[PDB]
């Protein structure tokens, strides 16, 4: 039957970007015309395909990755980008073929007392490969001498919180992001639109 897009888009709780969620999708009909929820700042850009007549193609599988980032960082979720999120949290392949859909969620993920639940990775020695997920919380060793799980000089916790308050600028307001990746191999196409 229908693909569980509302399961991942209209979902109540989203993930921290370093622990970005992945929802494999197969064996269903995909209606893309409903992904426009008319949220405040709706972003919908695709690579390798046109958003229109998208219910016209079929794919072997479709991956729905979801997370929350800061409003400025939505630019980093794109092929061939460097930065905070692209290097160490979520890396798109240079030949990415799919769509990126993001929207402002200041009304959901911001509390006046400040929301520190969402996290992102600050410290990492090397860039992420595309679609890598690093969930390690080992203390970052920035010095010559080992940390042994203790924060301090030359020894930092690798993650930092986002600090979402409603009155912050739009750049720093929370944004909910779903990246749909279209996989097509020499196998039956299990994800289709109408026709």
């Amino acid at each position: 039957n229908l693909c569980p897009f509302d399961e991942v888009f209209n979902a109540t709780r989203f993930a921290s970007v370093y622990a970005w969620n992945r929802k494999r999708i197969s064996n269903c009909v995909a209606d893309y015309s409903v992904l426009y929820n008319l949220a405040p700042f709706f972003t919908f850009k695709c690579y390798g395909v046109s958003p229109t007549k998208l219910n016209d193609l079929c794919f072997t599988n479709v991956y729905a990755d979801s997370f929350v980032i800061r409003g400025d960082e939505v630019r980093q979720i794109a092929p061939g980008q460097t930065g905070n999120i692209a290097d160490y949290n979520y890396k798109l392949p240079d030949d990415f073929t799919g769509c990126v859909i993001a929207w402002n969620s200041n009304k959901l993920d911001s509390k006046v007392s400040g929301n520190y639940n969402y996290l992102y990775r600050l410290f990492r020695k090397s860039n992420l490969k595309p679609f890598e997920r690093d969930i390690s919380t080992e203390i970052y060793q920035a010095g010559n001498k080992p940390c042994n799980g203790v924060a301090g000089f030359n020894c930092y916790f690798p993650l930092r919180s986002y600090s979402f308050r409603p009155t912050y600028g739009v750049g720093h307001q929370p944004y909910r992001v779903v990246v749909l990746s279209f996989e097509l191999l020499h196998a039956p196409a299990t994800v289709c639109g109408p026709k």
Partner: antibody
Amino acid sequence: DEVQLVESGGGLVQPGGSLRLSCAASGFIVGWNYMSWVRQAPGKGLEWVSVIYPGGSTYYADSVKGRFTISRHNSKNTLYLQMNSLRAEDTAVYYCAREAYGMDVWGQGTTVTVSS
Amino acid sequence: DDIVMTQSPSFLSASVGDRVTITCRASQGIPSSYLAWYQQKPGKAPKLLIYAASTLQSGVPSRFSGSGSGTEFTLTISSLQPEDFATYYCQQLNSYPPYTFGQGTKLEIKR
């Protein structure tokens, strides 16, 4: 391992010249840290010039775009700022700094004067 | 446009033993973790006083203290010492450059 940054390479050049500042660190490892170049013009404030991430990515101020290149030699544990097409407004004391919880390790500074 | 930090006052004269507050105002609301306060004396490099707008850097005397959130953050010396007469810059270290500084506040002697 007394932590410090020691800087060198600054000096006097006419406009359009090149100059490669270096910043040798002890106490931490430059390839593993966020390293920043910050300049301060005489009688003025502090201005961020450039930064290199541990993962490799480099960012520059709009003023130095296309003219300055930040880099590092891991074996010598040294940061570098190469300055090309130099201009009089780049005249400043240049510091290197390590940034984890604010910039906590600051170099001495080396002086760049660019004048015809 | 950009994220601009404005320090009030530019110049401020106090006496030894006085309580002093310097205010740093941001153009738009920012996470409090971004702020750092720096102290600089003539001819010497800046020294990190406070980061996260409230967390005290190690080795800094307890009289220094920072506070704030949103667009207004302050740094305070409880009892101003003779060695404290210097210039203080406020800073924001955010997730994507540029890192912006305030214009600095010069702390001079009251006579």
